[PDB]
């Protein structure tokens, strides 16, 4: 679906059997989720933004359903005020910007 | 134009007579630009993002041409590693997310 941006582009996601809300974020290379407990072995890694940095855990080939579109890929868990879906998964669901 | 996201969605902007590159960022409520000197009277404001906050200056009814589409609105100047075009201006240029 086309989603205009008069409001924040928040969508339903399903990950690890859990339902969450997340922001579709063309400004993000990576997908990063608030504290949740994922399965499996995690590598470490660190990421930055507008006020500074945060540390996070990294899982590969995590399945995420994003407005019902499946995607598999790298997901990051660490601390954020919002769940964020980044371009690594936006590409899989066929997400474009149009204007 | 439709812009897919296999690469970061960087576009040319023209602001204050100056040409810059900026990221189309559906994850941003506001538009925030690296150090540049905008003439006119600026109100203060502290935008938050990931890693906390940064202080910035705020100008209203700034004209920005974004890939050739004009927009007028609130622009913020303070420190960022990338110039960011937020939803306040994305709405004016008719920018949608589609998938
Ligand atoms: C090739 C280049 N190489 C070498 C230099 C690279 C490439 C990439 C990186 C990257 C890639 O990093 C990442 O893409 N990070 C994601 C991230 O934060 N993206 C953000 C872009 C950005 C903005 C500001 C400063 C720096 C980068 C925008 C996102 O849209 C953010 C997400 C967010 C939104 C709201 C709350 C928290 C986080 N929104 C944002 O910061 O909004 C701020 C507000 C706006 N208006 C009111 S506040 C993150 C969420 C996974 C990191 C790095 O340290 O070095 C790199 C180097």
Numbering used by the authors:
A (entry chain B), B (entry chain A): 1 to 99
Show the paper's wording:
HIV-1 protease (HIV-1 PR) is among the best-studied enzymes in biochemistry. This 99 amino acid long homodimeric aspartic PR plays a pivotal role in the viral replication cycle. In the assembled immature particle, the PR domain of Gag-Pol cleaves Gag and Gag-Pol at nine distinct sites to create the mature, functional subunits. Proteolytic processing results in a dramatic rearrangement of the particle core termed maturation, which is a prerequisite for HIV-1 infectivity.
The design of a photoinactivable inhibitor of HIV-1 PR was based on the structure of the PR inhibitor ritonavir (RTV). Compound 1 contains a photolabile 7-diethylamino-4-(hydroxymethyl)coumarin group connected via a carbamate linker to a RTV fragment, and is a tight-binding inhibitor of HIV-1 PR, displaying subnanomolar inhibition potency (Ki=170±20 pM, for detailed synthesis see Supplementary Fig. 1). To investigate the binding modes of compounds 1 and 2, we co-crystallized both with HIV-1 PR and determined the corresponding structures at resolutions of 1.6 Å and 1.4 Å, respectively. Both crystals were of identical space group (P61), and contained one PR dimer in the asymmetric unit. The structures were refined with two inhibitor molecules bound in alternative orientations related by 180° rotation with 50% relative occupancy. The crystal structures revealed that compounds 1 and 2 both occupy enzyme subsites S2, S1, S1′ and S2′. In addition, compound 1 interacted with the S3 enzyme subsite through the coumarin moiety. The extent of interactions with S3 residues was rather limited, however, and the coumarin moiety protruded from the enzyme active site cavity. The suboptimal interaction in the S3 pocket, compared with the interaction of the P3 moiety of RTV, is likely to contribute to the 10-fold difference in Ki values for RTV and compound 1. Binding of the P2′, P1′ and P2 substituents of compound 1 was similar to that of RTV, whereas differences were observed for interactions in the S1 and S2 pockets. In the HIV-1 PR-compound 1 complex, the carbamate between the coumarin moiety and the inhibitor formed a hydrogen bond with the Asp29A side chain, similar to the interaction of the corresponding group of RTV.
